[PDB]
Design a protein around this nucleic acid. Structure first.
Ligand code: CA
Ligand code: CA
Ligand code: MG
Ligand code: MG
Ligand code: MG
Length: 350
DNA sequence: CGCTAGTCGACAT
DNA sequence: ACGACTAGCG
């Protein structure tokens, strides 16, 4: 999630209702709904007590989309991305920190802060995700567990034409090149749509409305695959690109100290880190539901060697990928928690 | 004055 | 895997 990205391109956003896509198909970043629903039962989840509320909290949104005549596809986060290892590690450590801070120092001190610390230590497991999957499937709703980050999977489904819109609360989806992104959607179906084509309607952006340039902006503003330089947020990220007359991004990143009149000594780790982040946004491994194959988000260009993109996701066998995608194989422990098969028992597969 | 990083409440009841 | 509010810096 990029800080201040909403306001920056506010002019490319319009308030809609889900009924706009009646008869059409939307894909959902379900982990957001899960994180939002687990809040109402953070205590039981922190203390390891059995709870089943988040499932209902997802199924009500599902029932709403279904009621307004939408075909939803629920996409789930899968294996942890190596390029995102640092950020995810940070989230892990913060989760453990809040978990301890509540569980021990608030069970005997003050109980009012206990729920607050518990809510800051919520960790969406694949088990819970599988509860939601079981429910949705029982109500006839297709599901898909991304090989890695659901961002890339959703972006793929939109760019491939399988879905026309994507429901999420994560603004990262734009940097991935999604056509339409529905944000901040409430219980009844009122949210903020963001069309990619409308990005040109933003004063502050300038000529940074193209996919590549917008991607660059998002990356060097600060993301989950690479932290920004100190003192550089969205505005200066945009200004650098606006003032850049040179097509090559590397030379620009090198002369970033000259463009902004700031004292910036750019390291090489930030250069190669930038290349890594770009390659992550471009070719992160997703799952093709039709062909049942693990593919890069975009087809590999001429200036990229696939053997060096280990951080963008590891290739596994197509059968293993298919089993992960069906939610049969647990992400954390790699065991067959289920044996669901789509061929037996107009779906995504076949 | 524009802008960035960092804190703390809402997130959903 | 959030965002309003703002103190402080260039
Ligand atoms: Ca409408
Ligand atoms: Ca895997
Ligand atoms: Mg993010
Ligand atoms: Mg995500
Ligand atoms: Mg993201």
């Amino acid at each position: 999630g990029i800080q201040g990205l909403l306001q920056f391109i506010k002019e490319a956003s319009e308030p809609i209702h889900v009924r706009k896509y009646k008869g059409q198909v939307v894909a959902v970043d379900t982990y957001c709904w899960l994180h939002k629903g687990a809040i109402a039962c953070a205590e039981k989840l922190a203390k390891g007590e059995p709870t089943d509320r988040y499932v209902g909290f997802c199924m009500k949104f599902v029932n709403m989309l279904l009621s307004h005549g939408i075909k939803p596809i629920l996409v789930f986060d899968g294996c942890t991305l190596p390029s995102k290892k640092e950020v995810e590690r940070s989230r892990r450590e913060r989760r453990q920190a809040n978990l301890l801070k509540g569980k021990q120092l608030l069970r005997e001190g003050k109980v009012s802060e206990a729920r607050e610390c518990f809510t800051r230590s919520i960790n969406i497991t694949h088990a819970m995700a599988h509860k939601v999957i079981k429910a949705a499937r029982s109500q006839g709703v297709d599901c898909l567990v991304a090989p890695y980050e659901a961002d890339a999977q959703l972006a793929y489904l939109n760019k491939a034409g399988i879905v026309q819109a994507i429901i999420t609360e994560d603004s990262d989806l734009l940097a991935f090149g999604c056509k339409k992104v529905i944000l901040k959607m409430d219980q009844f179906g009122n949210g903020l749509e963001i069309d990619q084509a409308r990005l040109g309607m933003c004063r502050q952006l300038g000529d940074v409305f193209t996919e590549e340039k917008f991607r660059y902006m998002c990356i060097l503003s600060g993301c989950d695959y690479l932290s920004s330089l100190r003192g550089i947020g969205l505005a200066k990220a945009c200004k650098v690109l606006r003032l850049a007359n040179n097509p090559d991004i590397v030379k620009v990143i090198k002369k970033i100290g000259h463009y902004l009149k700031m004292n910036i000594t750019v390291p090489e780790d930030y250069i190669n880190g930038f290349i890594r982040a770009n390659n992550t946004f471009l070719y992160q491994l997703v799952f093709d539901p039709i062909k049942r194959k693990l593919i890069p988000l975009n087809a590999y260009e001429d200036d990229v060697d696939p053997e060096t993109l280990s951080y963008a996701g590891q290739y596994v066998d197509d059968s293993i990928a298919l089993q992960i995608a069906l939610g049969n194989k647990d992400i954390n422990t790699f065991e067959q928690i289920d044996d669901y098969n789509p061929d037996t028992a107009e779906n995504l597969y076949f």
